[PDB]
Structure formats: structure tokens, C-alpha cells
Amino acid sequence: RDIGLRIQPPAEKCDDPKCPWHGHLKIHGRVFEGIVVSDKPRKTVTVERQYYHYLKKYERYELRRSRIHAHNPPCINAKVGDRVLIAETRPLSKTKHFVVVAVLERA
């Protein structure tokens, strides 16, 4: 099956209606790549991405990081420390607006 990302689907199936691969969830908007830094809650992960910001006055850079909470389908089940790909969806909770679609490199 394809959902517009041109990547491999997960090996097994699930019954979660919030799964973009096997359920009714739809993805549309930005797609990011990051590192998981927390997986304590059920079906929830925190993903961190790093980038550089340029300071015009001092003509130098500084390091900044962005943290995003994402839904974790059972068919994927990412853990702490591995690279993941996330996509934007409709609001799912107070703070969750993304879903994990692929694990790129297991820890």
C-alpha cells in the first residue's frame, strides 16, 4: 500500500483506527525526521530535531532544538534513541498533531 511518501510499509498489521497504514487517519502537510527522546506515555513519543540559527549582528551561529509530540502506532512501536519520520495530521490530543510513519534506523 502507498500513502504518498514512497517508503516501505511496516511488516505487520494493527487494529488502531489512528494508524495511517491500516486505519482511517490521513496525512497532509509537513514531514520531518528526528530522534526519539521519550516513550513513557502509551502510544506517544517525543521527537527532537536540531538546527542552526544565524545571528546577523555577530555573524555567527547558535544551535537550537525543536521538540514535537507524536502518536506511536502499535505496528511500528518506536523506542528511545532511533531515527523516525513523522507527518502532520489533524489534532489528536491537546499536544499531539503528528504521527510516526517509519523507523529509519533502529537503535
Partner 1 sequence: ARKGPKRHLKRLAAPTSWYIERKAYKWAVRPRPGPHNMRTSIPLLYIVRDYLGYAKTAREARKILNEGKFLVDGRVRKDYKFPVGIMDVVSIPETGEHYRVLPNRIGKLILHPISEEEANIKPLRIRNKRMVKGAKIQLNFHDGTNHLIPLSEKDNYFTSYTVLMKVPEREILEVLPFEKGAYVFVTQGKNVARKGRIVEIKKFPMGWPDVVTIEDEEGELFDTLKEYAFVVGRDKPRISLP
CA atoms of 92 and 100, how far apart (whole Å): 13
**20 or 46, CB closer to partner 1?**
20
The footprint of Zn ion on residues 42-101 (CB under 5 A) is 73, 75
Residue 20 lies near Zn ion (rule: CB under 5 A): no
Q: How many residues bind RNA (CB under 7 A)?
A: 42
Residue 5 lies near partner 1 (rule: CB under 8 A): yes
CB of 11 to RNA, least distance (A): 19
- Interface residues toward partner 1, by CB under 8 A: 4-6, 28, 31
- Interface residues toward RNA, by CB under 7 A: 2-5, 16-18, 24-30, 38, 40-44, 46, 53, 56-57, 63-69, 71, 88-97
